[PDB]
Design a protein around this ligand. Sequence first.
Ligand SMILES: [Cl-]
Ligand SMILES: [Cl-]
Ligand SMILES: [Cl-]
Ligand SMILES: [Cl-]
Ligand SMILES: [Cs+]
Ligand SMILES: [Cs+]
Ligand SMILES: [Cs+]
Ligand SMILES: [Cs+]
Ligand SMILES: [Cs+]
Ligand SMILES: [Cs+]
Ligand SMILES: [Cs+]
Ligand SMILES: [Cs+]
Ligand SMILES: [Cs+]
Ligand SMILES: [Cs+]
Ligand SMILES: [Cs+]
Ligand SMILES: [Cs+]
Ligand SMILES: [Cs+]
Ligand SMILES: [Cs+]
Ligand SMILES: [Cs+]
Lengths: 395, 396, 396, 395
Amino acid sequence: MSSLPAVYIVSSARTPVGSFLGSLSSLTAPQLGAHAIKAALAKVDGLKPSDVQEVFFGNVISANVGQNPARQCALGAGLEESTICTTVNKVCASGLKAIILGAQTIMTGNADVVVAGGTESMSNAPHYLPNLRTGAKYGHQSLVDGIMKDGLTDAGKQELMGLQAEECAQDHGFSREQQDEYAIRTYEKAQAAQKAGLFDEEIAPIQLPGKPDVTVTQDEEPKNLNPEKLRAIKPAFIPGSGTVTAPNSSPLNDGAAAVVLVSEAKLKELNLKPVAKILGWGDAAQQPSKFTTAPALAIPKALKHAGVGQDAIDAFEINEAFSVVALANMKLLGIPEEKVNLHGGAVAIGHPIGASGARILTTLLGVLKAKKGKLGCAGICNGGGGASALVVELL
Amino acid sequence: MSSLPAVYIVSSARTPVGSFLGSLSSLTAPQLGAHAIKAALAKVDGLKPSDVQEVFFGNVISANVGQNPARQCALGAGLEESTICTTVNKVCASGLKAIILGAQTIMTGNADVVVAGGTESMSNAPHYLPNLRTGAKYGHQSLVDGIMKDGLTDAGKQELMGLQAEECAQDHGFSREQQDEYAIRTYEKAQAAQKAGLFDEEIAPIQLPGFKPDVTVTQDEEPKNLNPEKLRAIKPAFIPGSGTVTAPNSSPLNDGAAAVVLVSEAKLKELNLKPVAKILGWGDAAQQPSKFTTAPALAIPKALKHAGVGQDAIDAFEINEAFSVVALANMKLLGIPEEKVNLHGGAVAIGHPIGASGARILTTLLGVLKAKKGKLGCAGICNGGGGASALVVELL
Amino acid sequence: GMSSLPAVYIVSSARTPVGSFLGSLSSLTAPQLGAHAIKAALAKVDGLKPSDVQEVFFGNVISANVGQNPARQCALGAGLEESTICTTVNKVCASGLKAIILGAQTIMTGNADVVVAGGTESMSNAPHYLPNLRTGAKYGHQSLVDGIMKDGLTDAGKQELMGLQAEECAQDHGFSREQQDEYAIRTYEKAQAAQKAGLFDEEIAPIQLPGKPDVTVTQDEEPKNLNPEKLRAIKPAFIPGSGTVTAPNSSPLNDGAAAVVLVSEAKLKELNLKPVAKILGWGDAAQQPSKFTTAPALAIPKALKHAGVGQDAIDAFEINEAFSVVALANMKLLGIPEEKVNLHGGAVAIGHPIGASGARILTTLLGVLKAKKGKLGCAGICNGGGGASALVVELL
Amino acid sequence: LPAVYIVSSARTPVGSFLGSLSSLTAPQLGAHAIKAALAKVDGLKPSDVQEVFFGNVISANVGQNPARQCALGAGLEESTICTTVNKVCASGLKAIILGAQTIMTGNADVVVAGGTESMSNAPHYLPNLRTGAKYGHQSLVDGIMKDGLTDAGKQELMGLQAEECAQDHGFSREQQDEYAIRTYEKAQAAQKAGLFDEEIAPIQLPGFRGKPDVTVTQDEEPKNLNPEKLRAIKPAFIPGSGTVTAPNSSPLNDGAAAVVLVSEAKLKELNLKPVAKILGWGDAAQQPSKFTTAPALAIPKALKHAGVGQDAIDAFEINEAFSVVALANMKLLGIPEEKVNLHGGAVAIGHPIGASGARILTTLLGVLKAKKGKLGCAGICNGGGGASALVVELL
Ligand SMILES: [Cl-]
Ligand SMILES: [Cl-]
Ligand SMILES: [Cl-]
Ligand SMILES: [Cl-]
Ligand SMILES: [Cs+]
Ligand SMILES: [Cs+]
Ligand SMILES: [Cs+]
Ligand SMILES: [Cs+]
Ligand SMILES: [Cs+]
Ligand SMILES: [Cs+]
Ligand SMILES: [Cs+]
Ligand SMILES: [Cs+]
Ligand SMILES: [Cs+]
Ligand SMILES: [Cs+]
Ligand SMILES: [Cs+]
Ligand SMILES: [Cs+]
Ligand SMILES: [Cs+]
Ligand SMILES: [Cs+]
Ligand SMILES: [Cs+]
């Protein structure tokens, strides 16, 4: 990695994360992505939107979004029609893999300024009618929920991710109580960070056309913590013996996040101030129903690519697809919770799946700054068996 | 790009291209992509499917395909669960951008063996019901055709790509007759290539098991449909009366997949592999969305410049025939004679499974260079939204 | 004449409250509403058992997804014997009154002695249709058909909504937006005055909704929505600018049911029953489908002739208010003063559950004749398609 | 009470499901049968018809008042009273009873009654679009299964009620299969010998985009019999031990039929020639799942009301909802098959449910003409537990 051109993050931005059919549900995925891209570029003193040459944007449930979600994001943000745009789907890791591809495109010399990230509007995922072209002559038919089909169901086992979370709890020995206490802790961290203003800088508030105008400034989920109801609710995927609940799982959510990447030569030519340096990354994958612990492969790989030891990381973002996912990866890797998701995670903040990989990187940069850290690592598992991870240095 | 590590193509393969609701309509997009991947890998003497580390696969209309189409393609082809899989959507250019990203992943050292390509099952693209979650209290409601919405309609103007093809004929002065005569010529080239067996190597025939006798699908479905009299007499498809773009002189809707196998120099030597071709460079470009038709006139010089190759040195071009007018306009703007273009026919005659065509034309290009004893080839493909991608290869 | 045929007596009537579209009763199906009204009407007859009911006619218009034979479900849901004959009747808006006519006739031919008749409609639960899933639709956006619009509110011939034909009525007979608005206010006041005084309490059978205590719908939902400021200010519903028909001066979409018990003169004396009323005659009429609004001006005199009764002898009229202009026009053509029409309000204020309204207005008519100490009543109701039905009762 | 005379009758060919008549709507078939019936009565003009009762079961998406569209399509006056009736499979016969009753109370002099069904064009239903469904796959209800073929209380298809009838009365897969073959050959014989030619009004489907015009003259189903395939195909509603199959059950079909009825006075006033006189009728019902044998109540009730003994009837038309049903009701009433469905039955002819009650009356008049009988009786069972029976004297 060191033998390649350096890639600098000169800014990042995210929308608030809205709840399913909640505060951001009137916005399409490209409207959220354009908003995040525009807000990221506005932060870079000396860089113009017309300087952006290429965009990689994550998006998982693209049905009915229209041609090339990333291109709509880029044009809706005011980028030039000359901008190269590609939409990326690695399910929940789409937003981080997009950033990786953007970094590589600078490294091979095909761009000097790249915007990358991801968006998802799970609120506006449609239902599918799959057999209208050839017909179904007789019998009841089905309308497929696109979130379930293209977001949350393992293709091979045809089981929702919550059932894979239960495999994780069984495979690595985490009870209902341990998952519940993890979830309460991450809600508490997200609420503390909210109240102390620590998300103010990364979040770009959304102004909804008005009745008068509404401004959405906060992530919607963190305030929902009720620890009594959380400990009392019935398990959501396995009656009786189940351990995974809707409170201790990530929700369905809407949101977007973006980073701006520049080459070393371009940094100097425009006299830009870098926020961070990308040191390395890693993708890994294993058995699809075991996607939950693929970050225990991707994270060591990213660290080795970056040439950084694990003990040197100041903060990790381990995406909280479920509380059990953080618990199992912390156990497998030997990472203390004291270094993980310092401002809370997706169980408390939300999980707009095509965007989460870029969302946690944005939050990591804030964590490193708030905590006077220098080296951070983001790792995110994805449906299908994969994970992606990235190592940054805050400058 | 010379200072960049070398990327070798050690094999490629494609499915036959089936017609809309036609010979391959019973197969999903990942079944088509798995078929192409598995056939491509089976050609490489000394390389195993378990050696593949990373997959990039194009796919545009992914609705109802399930989690990560590219991952389903990889697993369905027998690749290891350890394989890194990413689905890519640059509309009609998806299958070529996927190959570009695969090459880059070798070049930055993160893989030594990459499969890349694309797949589309336009037959199995569903319809959408967009307002069931919140409800619609009263009134007739729409069922959205996913092909039109996510494949064929420019997002900005809400207009079908055929309409922007008319804009191309008006802008660049191509009559109905010029487009029809181009279409007939590319059908004849594709039929001649079919008849002479020149697609035999690149196509992996598909066996459909009987649920009833089995069916083997061996050839592209569309080329045989040429009827020159009906083609010249048919009505315009998008502008009544004065229209010039028709269904016969446009690409159809189709099902198919294509894949290439990429390796680093080190791996080529380690396994003593025989390379088919070397990737010399690539280029993406974009312009105004409704002018996507002539974005290849930007991407092709860019790819040539990245490759350090002059346009005159190319032996064969693939300019993807999204419409007949698209090949004509780009040949005119670049000054490329038609005798160097789509020598075995193009997408108007062969078919256009949009997520696969970028990889499909590269596969066909490699067969064209071999049959015509060429050395340098260039593939370029426009995409809805204003984009294009292009790639230069050297036959070894 | 009617005198050469057996006499038919009304011994009981009952109706549910009339719910608003997706409103208070939207959780109940049309057979549940109908079973409720049947059960209530039978509970009122001292000396009669539900097992004595031999045949049921029940109106229902939008029967999609209600299941096999809605009238049979209303009858078995009400606790009638499984030997009971059950037929569902669709004369659109007139179904509820034609089912009563058909029941009366079944006694008069001597095929039954105890008949329950009426109608039901859950417009809240009218589904959307997907019309072409069996054969398929290969390419293009498709439609989900609102069953209320298709099977309830749209004239089949000209494919125009009945509201636009109410506008035709207004232009035909000279009634302004102001005139229609003022009538609507007046019928809303008559409705609210009736509610205030308890004059609907007898006819209405309140509905209990399980869930620990039970919620109870006692009143019609629409009358309280009156707002004269908003009513006179709202924009027209079918013709921007020059239109006179508005949603406030039209009938709403509604849920509800109503039923009457009929007995032959033999059974009335055989188990010594108190008769509420006698059926003296009826009339069906029809004309140009787009002129259905004035079809009661034909059906009403035909029913009066059949009864051997003069229009001046009638003490109270119920002219169903499909739209305000329907009541106005029919009063104009017939020469009937408003002081004898819809004395407790009409469908504009009360609701129009279309399969039930024919029986609903007859139920309210009996209450008006009681409250205002009348003897002769006439109910007339128009239906989409050009028709109307009318019935003449004598309070006993 | 006044006498009621049938002056003519007509029926469309019975088309197969998605078959020869699938391009026609239920009111188009119904209009076609009314117009053909009224063309047969010289001395009666179409404008003399005052009232229509027309059966139709699956009315979804047919439009306002199917019977009204039938009447207007046929050329009847806008002044005509039109009512659609639904007693499921018995709708087309209950309509005729209602028409007779309307003449008997002196409210009409000329009535048209019958039924129509287009099961090819029955839609699917989306029942929850108005209130919505936030998350989860949803159902498109097949309108034929819901409003036509499923008992409401038991929620089971009519094929399962057929198996009940088999176990209740002792008929095996072989007995039902031999009856199906018997009635199939009775249908083929009549086609070959022209015994349906009078009752059927052929339909003209003109193609004018260059395609050739098509005339449908035959019933589509009777030619499909293959006894080798019949005896050997698997059961339809109970695997392994079932007795009911598609070849020995009635199919889903398209078709319509109509009769013209006149009062005693109108027959004399216009000098009309009566085909038959309606002598009596009966409706009966019992347990909904035991609807198969409700004809065993309606047939005697109709005979009693007409003042005619069972031994005097020359031909019965007992609608073959299933082969078992004809066999069972013959065993209950003690009727020999040699005087039943002499031109075939619905198992071989087809069963457009809203029309069959008039379809079998039409075919009954053609049997009495050909067997030179005078007393004929038709009975039809319907979903929900009901049945209707009519008795006519040919003149
Ligand atoms: Cl994966
Ligand atoms: Cl583009
Ligand atoms: Cl009518
Ligand atoms: Cl019944
Ligand atoms: Cs800036
Ligand atoms: Cs600067
Ligand atoms: Cs900010
Ligand atoms: Cs949660
Ligand atoms: Cs550290
Ligand atoms: Cs191999
Ligand atoms: Cs081959
Ligand atoms: Cs073509
Ligand atoms: Cs050359
Ligand atoms: Cs009682
Ligand atoms: Cs009461
Ligand atoms: Cs109203
Ligand atoms: Cs005639
Ligand atoms: Cs005939
Ligand atoms: Cs059959």
